[PDB]
Nucleic acid binder design. Structure first.
Ligand SMILES: Nc1ncnc2c1ncn2[C@@H]1O[C@H](COP(=O)(O)OP(=O)(O)O)[C@@H](O)[C@H]1O
Ligand SMILES: [Mg+2]
Length: 647
RNA sequence: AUACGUCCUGAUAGUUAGUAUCCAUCG
RNA sequence: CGAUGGAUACUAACUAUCAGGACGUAU
């Protein structure tokens, strides 16, 4: 076992955390996870008690899916306490009370995402008085209507005697771009919501964490996009003519599904965009993928859509015919036809490789792109370049990771991803078999990465926190930070960089010597304009306007009907103005035919339409529970045919 | 010539509504 | 394939500030 040795600032922070509820602000790579580990290990005596006798339990909450495994492995390795792991893949929602009781009895420490915790707490399956300790990972995401805020709202009503301690872990404080003056208001709202005092040790400010923390060097690379191959510009003109023709077709010719031709035009301008950003070959690859999808679709299509698809097929035929003239890949010159920006990226990678060839240290690099499909086509492109056998591309290993949206029905998505495959790719990267990674914002936040030397930003950062975490993604010594900037964008980029640097400076200076939060601010905010539905009182399960729409949609999904069609409530909106002439909104909905209740349900009026939908949802839920379909714990019941006949 | 008040236009900051796109969870 | 959450961009409205134009009053 590792045989860790405590450091003075670690114990200094631990004593303060034990004394009072606090929020930890530390630089990246410092080891706040170990602070949480030690704090958990110190208070392990209470967890030994049985659940039936009131023995409390300690929870851990995290944002995304891979972090669930990441933190759980650390907590299992460094402690003898038993831990449990649950995520939404195994369909934990369809369980009943007894199974949850057994799971709670088995495990002492539980780690899950926020939504599952909220779903469990709302249905009355657990009592907040049984929580020993709760840990907030990435405590800067608790804003507006985030699930963290709803869990806090649940926490507020509990009596102070049995309230558990609250501890916060973060690397960034402000979620978005803020004015230098508004930073105080943002941090005040944060510490008012969490009901804890953010702390900063005098030790971490001086030399202590400075040696352990790392800072990269920043490089600004300018590029121009107006210049492009003359043939490529000819192709863009051709697609402009084609889109004009398609728009004329849409305007002149009636369409049974105008959204279908809109989809044709929009996938077209997507293809034009890929040509602009990447080049003709990648555009043709997307074109052949789309023609494969067209072959899939042509099995079941009507005459008009198939005709316009045939015309667009002729357009791709013309595009490929023109591409045959400039088949530079067949001429073994792949550099020429690609976009200049990709050329600049290739040149930068060549410079890095020429620098590191003498270095015995191996290569490790991360690439950030906004769009999943863009990352996929980029991965294909670098894979092909490596397959080209050329010297500067032979050593390149490329992989991609994106968010997963598993479909129970077929409804196939072109992108390929699986949670098991996700963890396999992650461990493959950790072993070091892959050096270059192209990823979206899934891995951008908080997840530890192996020793990396280079981080390159394909796209510009969007807010302060994204810039901070992307800078902190590099952990090894002598790291590199590179951002590409368009020629006309450099002034705004520089001014935003100055704003970010001054924001970081004032954040560092302001965090020291701040007074404890005021509970008057904690009970000050109130957004719930209506009380929830409490049939059995405080103990029994409740339903809040936030979850009522999801409840109705889930129950409608559970209705016995055809697989092809989905029963969806029809929403009718009524606008009215009172004697005050303010904008009042009121909603009304109708259940499908499978509902025993047929009369439309209406709700109270209020200025916003979303609240009108929520009010109608809550009224419908209360009426449906009154009818008797919903069970004791207010969850939708799969009323089988035998169940319907018996009732 | 100035200040105040009212109206209009333009810009900035905040709030609200709508629209579009993207990402992440829930199924 | 639906919902929720977040981010960005656009539009519209309201509030506040500034600038400019017009009118009334006072100095
Ligand atoms: N006493 C210790 N023994 C072993 N490793 C340590 C010790 N203290 C810090 N570390 C290392 O420091 C790193 C801290 O990173 P992490 O645990 O992800 O949290 P954070 O990113 O908040 O610093 C860990 O990877 C851990 O290996
Ligand atoms: Mg971290």
């Amino acid at each position: 076992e590792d045989e860790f040795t405590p450091r003075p600032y670690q114990v200094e922070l631990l004593e303060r955390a034990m004394k009072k509820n606090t929020i930890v602000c530390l630089g990246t790579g410092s080891g706040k996870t170990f602070i949480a580990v030690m704090l958990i290990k110190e208070l392990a005596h209470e967890i030994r008690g049985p659940f039936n006798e009131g023995g409390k339990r300690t929870f851990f909450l995290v944002n995304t899916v891979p972090l669930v495994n990441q933190q759980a492995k650390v907590i299992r390795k460094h402690t003898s306490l038993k831990v449990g792991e649950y995520v939404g893949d195994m369909g934990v929602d369809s369980w009943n009370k007894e199974k949850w009781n057994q799971e709670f009895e088995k495990h002492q420490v539980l780690v899950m995402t926020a939504q599952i915790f909220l779903d469990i707490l709302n249905h009355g399956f657990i009592s907040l008085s049984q929580v020993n300790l709760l840990i907030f990972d990435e405590c800067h995401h608790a804003v507006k209507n985030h699930p963290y805020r709803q869990i806090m709202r649940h926490y507020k009503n509990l009596e102070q005697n049995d309230r558990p301690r609250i501890l916060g872990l973060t690397a960034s404080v402000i979620n978005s771009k803020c004015k230098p003056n508004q930073v105080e208001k943002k941090i005040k709202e944060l510490e008012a919501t969490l009901n804890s005092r953010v702390v900063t040790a005098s030790d971490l400010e001086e030399v202590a964490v400075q040696k352990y923390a790392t800072k990269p060097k920043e490089i600004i690379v300018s590029y121009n996009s107006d210049r492009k191959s003359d043939t490529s510009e000819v192709i863009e003109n051709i697609i402009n003519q084609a889109l004009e023709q398609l728009s004329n077709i849409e305007e002149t010719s009636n369409l049974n599904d105008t959204n279908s031709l809109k989809q044709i035009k929009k996938v077209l301008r997507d293809i034009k965009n890929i040509l602009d950003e990447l080049g003709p070959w990648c555009a043709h690859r997307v074109i052949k993928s789309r023609i494969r999808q067209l072959e899939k679709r042509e099995s079941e299509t009507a005459e008009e859509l198939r005709t316009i698809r045939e015309l667009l097929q002729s357009i791709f035929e013309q595009i490929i015919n023109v591409l045959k003239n400039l088949e530079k890949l067949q001429k073994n010159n792949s550099v020429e036809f690609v976009s200049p920006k990709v050329k600049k990226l290739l040149e930068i990678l060549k410079q890095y490789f020429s620098n590191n060839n003498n270095s015995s240290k191996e290569l490790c690099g991360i690439i950030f792109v906004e769009r999943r499909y863009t990352a996929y086509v980029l991965y294909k492109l670098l894979n092909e370049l490596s397959a080209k056998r050329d010297d500067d591309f032979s050593f390149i290993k490329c992989d991609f990771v994106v968010g997963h949206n598993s479909s129970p029905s077929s409804k196939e998505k072109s992108t390929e991803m699986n949670s098991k495959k996700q963890k396999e790719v992650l461990k493959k990267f950790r072993k070091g078999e892959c050096n270059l990674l192209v990823a979206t914002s899934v891995v951008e936040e908080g997840i530890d990465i192996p020793k990396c030397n280079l981080v390159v930003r394909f796209d510009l950062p969007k807010n302060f926190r994204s810039y901070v975490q992307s800078k902190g993604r590099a952990r090894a010594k002598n790291s590199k930070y590179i951002i590409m900037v368009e020629e006309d964008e450099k002034n705004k980029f520089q001014e935003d960089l100055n704003q970010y640097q001054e924001i970081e400076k004032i954040l560092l200076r302001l965090c020291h010597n701040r007074d404890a939060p005021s509970e008057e601010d904690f009970d000050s905010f109130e957004d719930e304009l209506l009380p929830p539905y409490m049939p059995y009182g405080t103990d029994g399960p409740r339903v809040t306007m936030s979850s009522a729409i999801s409840l109705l949609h889930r129950y409608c999904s559970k209705l016995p009907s055809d697989r092809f069609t989905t029963l969806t409530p029809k929403f009718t909106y009524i606008e009215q103005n009172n004697e005050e002439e303010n904008k009042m909104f009121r909603c009304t909905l109708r259940l499908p035919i499978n509902s025993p209740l047929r009369e439309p349900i209406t709700g109270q009026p209020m200025p916003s339409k979303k609240l009108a939908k929520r009010s109608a949802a809550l009224e419908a839920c209360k009426k449906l529970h009154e009818m008797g379909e919903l069970d004791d714990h207010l969850l939708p019941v799969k009323i089988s045919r035998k169940n319907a006949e018996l009732k």
